[PDB]
Amino acid sequence: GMTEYKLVVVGAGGVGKSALTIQLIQNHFVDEYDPTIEDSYRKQVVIDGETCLLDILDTAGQEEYSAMRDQYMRTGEGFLCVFAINNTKSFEDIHHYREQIKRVKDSEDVPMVLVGNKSDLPSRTVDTKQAQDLARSYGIPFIETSAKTRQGVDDAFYTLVREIRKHK
Ligand X SMILES: Nc1nc2c(ncn2[C@@H]2O[C@H](COP(=O)(O)OP(=O)(O)O)[C@@H](O)[C@H]2O)c(=O)[nH]1
146 binds Mg ion (CB under 5 A): no
For residue 120, the partner it binds in ligand A1I1P, ligand X, Mg ion, none, with Cβ less than 5 to 8 A by kind, is ligand X
Residue 59 CB, nearest distance to Mg ion (Å)? Answer: 8
Q: Does 18 bind Mg ion (CB under 5 A)?
A: yes
User: Which residues have a C–N gap over 2.5 Å right after them in the chain?
Assistant: none
Q: Residue 15: what are its φ and ψ, rounded to 5°?
A: -80, -15
Rounded Cα distance, 138 and 5, in Å: 22
Taking CB under 6 A as the criterion, the residue among 69, 148, 150, 162 binding ligand A1I1P is: 69
Question: Which residue's CB is nearer to ligand X, number 14 or number 136?
Answer: 14
Please identify, using beta-carbon distances, which residue of 96 and 136 lies nearer to ligand A1I1P: 96
Three-state DSSP at 47 gives strand
CB of 95 to ligand A1I1P, least distance (A): 9
Give 73 or 140: the residue with its C-beta nearer to ligand A1I1P: 73
10 binds ligand A1I1P (CB under 6 A): yes
Task: Please count the residues of this chain forming the interface with ligand A1I1P, following the rule CB under 6 A.
Answer: 15
Order of all β-strands in the sheet with 112-117:
39-47, 50-58, 4-10, 78-84, 112-117, 142-144
A 10 A CB-CB count for 95 gives 13
Tell whether residue 17 is a contact of ligand X (CB under 6 A). Answer: yes
* Cα–Cα separations (whole angstroms), residue 165 to 8, 47, 51, 64, 161: 16, 11, 14, 29, 6
Residues 43 to 62 in contact with Mg ion, rule: CB under 5 A? 60
- Beta-strand (E) ranges in the chain? 4-10, 39-47, 50-58, 78-84, 112-117, 142-144
Q: Which residues bind Mg ion (CB under 5 A)?
A: 18, 60
Q: Which residues bind ligand X (CB under 6 A)?
A: 13-19, 31, 33, 35, 117-118, 120-121, 146-148
